[PDB]
Design a protein around this ligand. Sequence first.
Ligand SMILES: CC(C)C[C@H](CP(=O)(O)[C@@H](N)c1ccccc1)C(=O)O
Ligand SMILES: CC(C)C[C@H](CP(=O)(O)[C@@H](N)c1ccccc1)C(=O)O
Ligand SMILES: [Zn+2]
Ligand SMILES: [Zn+2]
Ligand SMILES: [Zn+2]
Ligand SMILES: [Zn+2]
Ligand SMILES: [Zn+2]
Ligand SMILES: [Zn+2]
Lengths: 52, 509, 514, 517
Amino acid sequence: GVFGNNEELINKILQSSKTSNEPVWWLPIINEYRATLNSKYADINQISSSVK
Amino acid sequence: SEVPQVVSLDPTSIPIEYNTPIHDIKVQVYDIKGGCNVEEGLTIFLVNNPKENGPVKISSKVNDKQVSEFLKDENMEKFNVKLGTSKHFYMFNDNKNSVAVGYVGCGSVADLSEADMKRVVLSLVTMLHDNKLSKLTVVFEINVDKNLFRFFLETLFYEYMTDERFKSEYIKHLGVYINNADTYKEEVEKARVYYFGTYYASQLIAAPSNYCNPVSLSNAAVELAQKLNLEYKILGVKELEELKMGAYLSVGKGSMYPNKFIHLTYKSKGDVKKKIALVGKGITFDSGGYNLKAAPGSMIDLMKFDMSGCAAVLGCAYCVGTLKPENVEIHFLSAVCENMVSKNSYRPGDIITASNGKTIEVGNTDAEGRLTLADALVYAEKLGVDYIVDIATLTGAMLYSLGTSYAGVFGNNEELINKILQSSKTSNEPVWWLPIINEYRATLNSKYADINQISSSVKASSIVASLFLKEFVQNTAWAHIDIAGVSWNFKARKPKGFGVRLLTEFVLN
Amino acid sequence: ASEVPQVVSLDPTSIPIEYNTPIHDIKVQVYDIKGGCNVEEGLTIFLVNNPGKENGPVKISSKVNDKQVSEFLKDENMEKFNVKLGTSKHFYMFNDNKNSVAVGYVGCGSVADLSEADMKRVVLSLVTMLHDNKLSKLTVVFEINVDKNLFRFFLETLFYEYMTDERFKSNMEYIKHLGVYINNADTYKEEVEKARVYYFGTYYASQLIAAPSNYCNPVSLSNAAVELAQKLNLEYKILGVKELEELKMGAYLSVGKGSMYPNKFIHLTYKSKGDVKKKIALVGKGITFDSGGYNLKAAPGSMIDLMKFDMSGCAAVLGCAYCVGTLKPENVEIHFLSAVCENMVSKNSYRPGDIITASNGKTIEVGNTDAEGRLTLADALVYAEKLGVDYIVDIATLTGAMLYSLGTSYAGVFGNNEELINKILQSSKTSNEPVWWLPIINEYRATLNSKYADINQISSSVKASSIVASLFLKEFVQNTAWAHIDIAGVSWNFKARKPKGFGVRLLTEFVLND
Amino acid sequence: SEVPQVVSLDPTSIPIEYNTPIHDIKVQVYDIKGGCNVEEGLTIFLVNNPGKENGPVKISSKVNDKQVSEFLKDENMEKFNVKLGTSKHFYMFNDNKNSVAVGYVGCGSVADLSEADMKRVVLSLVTMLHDNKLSKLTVVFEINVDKNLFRFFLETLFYEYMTDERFKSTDKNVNMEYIKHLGVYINNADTYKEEVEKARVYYFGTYYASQLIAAPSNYCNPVSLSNAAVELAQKLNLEYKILGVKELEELKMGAYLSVGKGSMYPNKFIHLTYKSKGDVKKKIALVGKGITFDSGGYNLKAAPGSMIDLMKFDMSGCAAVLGCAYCVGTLKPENVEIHFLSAVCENMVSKNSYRPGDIITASNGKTIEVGNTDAEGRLTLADALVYAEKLGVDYIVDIATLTGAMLYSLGTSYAGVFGNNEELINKILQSSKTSNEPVWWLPIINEYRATLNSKYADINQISSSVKASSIVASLFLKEFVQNTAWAHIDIAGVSWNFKARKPKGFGVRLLTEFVLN
Ligand SMILES: CC(C)C[C@H](CP(=O)(O)[C@@H](N)c1ccccc1)C(=O)O
Ligand SMILES: CC(C)C[C@H](CP(=O)(O)[C@@H](N)c1ccccc1)C(=O)O
Ligand SMILES: [Zn+2]
Ligand SMILES: [Zn+2]
Ligand SMILES: [Zn+2]
Ligand SMILES: [Zn+2]
Ligand SMILES: [Zn+2]
Ligand SMILES: [Zn+2]
C-alpha cells in the first residue's frame, strides 16, 4: 500500500511500481480519524482509541 | 406475503413513517448582500478563521442594532472557531422580541470535507434539540459549492429527525443566508428528497429483525412500489426453485421466514438509452449460521444491519421514482433472507449449486452474503442491462482496510468504477477504489466443487469475496460496493443510511 | 397437568420426586448433657473443641454410663488425637454387655463460636462417618456452645447432607434413631420438627434443580408444582401461552419462543385461616435450561453443562411453599410465582437486537439473548405488583458476576426499600443462609437508555452486571417494596457437585418472622 | 535520591504544579438576601423546580438591576426548563449601559441533589467556562445545600476547571484563560464562608494526587515519587524518612523486596509523619499502594481487557495518601498523630524478577507462596502493614488499586471497604458521607481462608478455587495485622475516570475527613 501527502509523488511511486513490476496500490489518508489520535496529556497519541 | 408468527405478540409489519416533521419545514434561501434580518428564533453563523483555534469574527451585516452590538469584534473574539465548537445566547432585539444568536466554528481550513461538515451540522443539531424553536436561520460565512450545500441540508434534516417508532416540537421555518443564493435554491427540494431516501433506508436498517424479516421487508418494498408507481414482482420459494437459485435458497433454509426475492423496476417515459441493475444484500439477520457469531468482537447484536444494502437500493428507488430521470430503466433487486441456526440450516462443508450451474463448496456459513448475491447477480445479468452495481455489508475486513468512513468499491470495468467514484464526489458519500487481485483467485479452487466460497489461506477477505462474485458476472460491466465498515454509525448508535444518495447520483448523472 | 411433549418415546415425561425420605423415619430425642450420657447403643460422637490451644488435644468431659467406653475416653488415650476443625476418629468396641458400639469425636477447632461455615465442616465430617455406618442409632454429644438457630442449622445440614439423591441411578444403612445431648435440652426440642420441615423444603428444591433439563422442563416442572399444591392444599393456577398472550407478557414469551416446550407461568397461593395482615409475592427465576440462545454459551468457563441450575430461583420458591404450607403461619397471604421457560437455539428463537414489549407497556431492546432471566422476571414482577401485595421478593441465578463479587458463599440482595432489605438480612441471620446487601447505583441507569426502545436489556459498557440487572428489574416495580436476591454464585455446590437448595430457609424465615 | 536513566533523555523528576491558576482566584461569598449585583462576565443561577419534572425556570432571587430583572421575569423564562444538567446563556445591557452575560444551570426536580447530581451540575457550569474568555464568575444558589455539599460544589468546580498541561508541548491550548474572580451568592452566607478555603485545600490535595497518578511511569518511578514526597514533606514541615533497599533488607521485608527485584529503580519506602501539638488522642497509620507501573511481571498483562496502558495508575493509593498529607499538613488538626506510608516499587519483567512459584518471607516471618506475580500489591502491602503495626497505632487504614474484580462488584462509582473492626469501618463510611466520595462495605468471608492454605509455605498469595479476588485479597492482608483495628479500601474500580480519560484523585478527601473528625 502507498499513502502520502502529495498526489504528484504518489503517482511517481505508482509509475515506478509499473516499470519495476513491484505492485503497489494507493490507499487514502482519511483525516476524519485524526481526532482519535488526540491525547489528554501529550501532544498526540501513538495509536488510535477507536479506529481499527 | 402473510408474516408468520411464533406467538400472537410477534410483529407482522415494519412500522414506517412517510410524513416526517422535516417535510413541514418551510425553507427560504436569501442572498447575504443586503444584510441579514434577525427577528425570531435562532440565528447561527457558520464561521472559520483561516488562525488555528482563532477568534470568531462575523463579517455579515445584521439589520438589527442590538444584535449587531452583540456581534461586534470585541465580543466575538472571546470565542473560537475550533471545528464543531459552538456558543449561542438569548437576547432582546430592536423590537424587544426574544431571539437567540450564535455560531458554529468551522475551523481554519477554507474548504470543508464531508466529515468536517458532518461535525458542523452535528453541533447545530445539538442546539436544535435543546431549544424550543419556531425557526432556525443559518448564515454561511464559509465557502461551499452546490453539492456541499445540498449535503449540509440532507445531513441537517437526517440528524435532526428522531426515530421514535419503537418508543412507548420541531422548527417550522429554515432560513439560509448565503452569497449568490439564487444558484443554491434548486438544491433545497433535491435535499428533501435525498433526506427521505436516506431516512427511509435508515428506518429499515434500524428496525429489529423480529420486525424486519424477509416477508415484512418485501411487503414494505411492495408498498413503496405502489406509492411510486413502480412495477414490482416478489419471487417466492416456488419461483426461486424453478429458477434454480440454490446458493440463495441454501442460506435461508434455516429460517422460519420463506426467502423473498425483491424486483422493482423504474422505466422512463421516453426511449430507454441505459439499463441498470442495482443489487442489494438483504440478510435481515445474520446469526452466522452453524459458524455462529460467538467470538469476541463479532457484533452479533447489530446483525440486523446486514440488510443495509437492500435498504440502500430501496431508498434509491424512492429518490429515483420521485425525481423521475429520463432515458433510463432501473431494476432494483434484493435476494432477501435470514441466516439462522436450525435442524434445517445449511452446513459447513455443504456443496450447493448456483443458478448458473456452478457448484460451490461452503467453507463457512457466515460468508452467506456472497452466496445470495451470486444468484442475484446471475439474475440481474439475464435482464440484459448495461450496468450491474451491488452494494453489501459483505466483509468485516473492511473495518481494517478503510475503517468506518470510506466504503470500498471493486469492479471488472474501469469506466463503471470511475462513474461510481464521480457519484461519490457529488453525493459526498466517500468511496475508495480497491483492487480485485487475480493472483488470489487460485485459493478459491475447490478440491471437489467448481469453486470455494472462501479462501483458507488469504486474509484479504474483501478482495477474495470480490473475486468470488466476479465469477457470477460473465459479460457485463459490474461494480461492487462493500459497506460493511460504513453502514452503521457506532458512535451515534444508529444507521447512516449509506449508499442511497451515492446510488441516486449514479442513476441521475 | 399438561402433556409433556417428546421427541422420541424414550424422552421422560415427568420429574421423579421422592417425598418420603429415610430422613423422615429417624426418631430424634434430645437429652440434657448435665445428666451424663447413655452410650450403650450404636455410634456415639462427641463434638469437642480446645479453646486457646490451637489444634490442641481432645478431652472429653461428659460422664458416660459404660465402663468400657469410659476407659476409652480417658485423657491419656484421647490426647493422642487433636481438635483441628473437621478432623475425626471413631473406634468400634464392646460395651459392658458385650454388644458392639462405636465411639468417636469431630474436632470443632479452637474458637468457641462456630460459624455456619465451620458447622457445615463438622457435619460433613460426621456425614462421612455415617456414610460408612450400619449401626441403627447415632448419638451426638455437644461439648461445645451453640444457640437455638445454629443447633437447628446443624440438624438441617446433617439431614440434607446425609440424604443422597439416587433417582437417576439404576456399605451403610440409614439410622432409625438420633440422640442429642446438649445444654438446656428442653429449649432446643422445638427446633427438631422445624429442622425436619426446613430439610425437606431444601431437599425438594434440590431435587428439582438436580433434575436434568430433559427431565425438568417447563411442562414437567409446572406439573410438579401442581402436584405439590394438591398435596399441601394450596390454591394453584398454571397460565399457558394463550393466557400469557392475552396478558401481553411479550418479554417472557420472547425468551421461550425457541423452545419445544410451551411457557408455563406458575402461581400458587397460601392464604391463612384468619384475618390477612400481610400479602407477600415470592418470585423465582425459572429457566429450565439456559443454552444462552443465539448468544450461545461457548466461551471457556461459561459452564453450559450446569445450566439446568437456572431454575434454582423457582425451586427455592417451591421449596418455600412446602415449608409454608406445612408450618401454616397465620395472618399472611403468600403468592409463589415463577415464569417458567426454556432458552434455546432455533429458527423460532428471539434474536439479539429484537425489540420486545413487556406487559406494562415498556419496549425493550435485547442486547444479549443470554441475559434472559431479567426478561422473564420483568413480566413476572408486573404480574406480582398487580396482585396488590405488601412485599415482592424475587430470587434468581441472575448474574455470573456474583462469582467475582461475593463468590460461592454469600448471595447478594438488592432493593428499593431499606426496611424490606433489613428483614431479608434478619432472615439471613436466623436461617444461616448468608446474604449481603449490595447497592443499586442510580448513576448507572443512564447506561440502560436505548436509542430506539424505552430501555436496554443490558449495558454495553458498565461491567457491574449485578447492579445493572437490578436497575433493570427495578423498572418493573412502580410502588411496592421490592427486593431481589441474586444467587448465581451460591446456588450450585461445585466442590460437592450438587445443589445447595439455597433460599428455601431464607424465604421461609422471612415469611414466618414478619 | 538520584534517579537512574537509560539514556540522557529519561526524566529525572515528576513535573509538579503547586501554584495553580485556581489558587489565583479571588473568592467572595455574599448573602442572597442583599440581592445580586450583575456587573460583569457571566452570572449563573442554580435553579430547580420541585415536583414539576422538567418544570419552568423561575428566578427567585432579588436582582439589583432594572434591565436584568426585566430580562429574568417569569414570562421570559418559562420557555426554559430545569432538567438537570441543562444550561442557557443570556446577553443584555444592565443599568450602567454595560453588556453583561447571564444564565442558569438546571438542578432538576429533586430538592436534595446527590453527589452524582451535583457533579453533573458542575460539569455543566464548567462547559460554560471553557471556550469563553471571562475574568469573573458569579454563582447564585437558588437550591438548598448543606455545608458539606457546598464545599463539594467548590472542590469539584475547582478540580474540573483545572486543566493539566504538564506534558503538552507543541499543543498547549492557545485559548485557555482562567477567571480571576469567583462570586457566590447564597442564603445564610457567613455560615458557608469557612468552607471556601477548606474547599481550596481539598481541591489541591486531589489535584496533587491526580498529578502523580496521571504522570507516566517514565516520569513517576519509585525514586522520583519518593523524591516528590520528601519535597512535599519539606514544604509542609512534616517529619520524613525514605527507607532504601539496605534498610528494607535489615527489616526483612522480603515480600515487598521481591516485587521490586526486577526493576531498574531501587525500592523506596515513604514514611511521612504529622503530629499535633498537645495531647495525642489518636495515632493513625495510612497505607497506600505504590506500584509506579504494574506490568504483571512474568504473569504479564497480555490478556484482552488487561488495561496495561493504564497501569501507571497503580500508585493511586499512595497518591491518595500523599494528597491526604498535603491537606492534613495544611489544616493542622489537633490531638492526632498520622503516619503516611507507601512501600513504593515497580513490577517489571527482567532476568532479575521474582517468578510464579517462588517462596518468599515477609517481615513477620510468614512464608508466602507466589502463585501469580501480578498479584503484587498484596505482597507490598503485607510488609507495609507489618511495619505500620510496629508503630503502635490505633487505626491502620490502607487504600489500594488492588483488584480488577471491583469493576464487577461495585463498578466505577463506589469504592469497596473491608476490615477487621466494625467501628473503624463505620468511621470510614461516615467519612465517605461527609467527603462525598462513595464507599460500600463489603465482607471478609472467612470460609475462603482455607483456599489460601499452601502445601509448602505458611500461606498462599492467591486462591486456588475462589474468583472473588477482592475478598481473597482482603483475607490475605488480614494475615499481617495481628491486633490492630484495620480497614482496607479497594479503589481499583473508581480511581480512573474512563469517560474523562483522567484520574479522579479518589480518596484524598475521604482520608482527610477520616483524620479530621
Ligand atoms: C466470513 C467471515 C469472515 C464473516 C464476516 C462476513 P459477514 O457476512 O458475516 C458480514 N455480515 C459482517 C459485516 C460486518 C462485520 C462482521 C460481519 C466478516 O468478518 O467479514
Ligand atoms: C453471560 C452473562 C450474560 C451471564 C449472566 C446472566 P445468565 O442468565 O446467563 C446466568 N444464567 C448465569 C449464572 C451463573 C453463571 C453464569 C451465568 C449475567 O451477568 O448477565
Ligand atoms: Zn455472515
Ligand atoms: Zn452478512
Ligand atoms: Zn443466560
Ligand atoms: Zn440465566
Ligand atoms: Zn498486578
Ligand atoms: Zn497492581
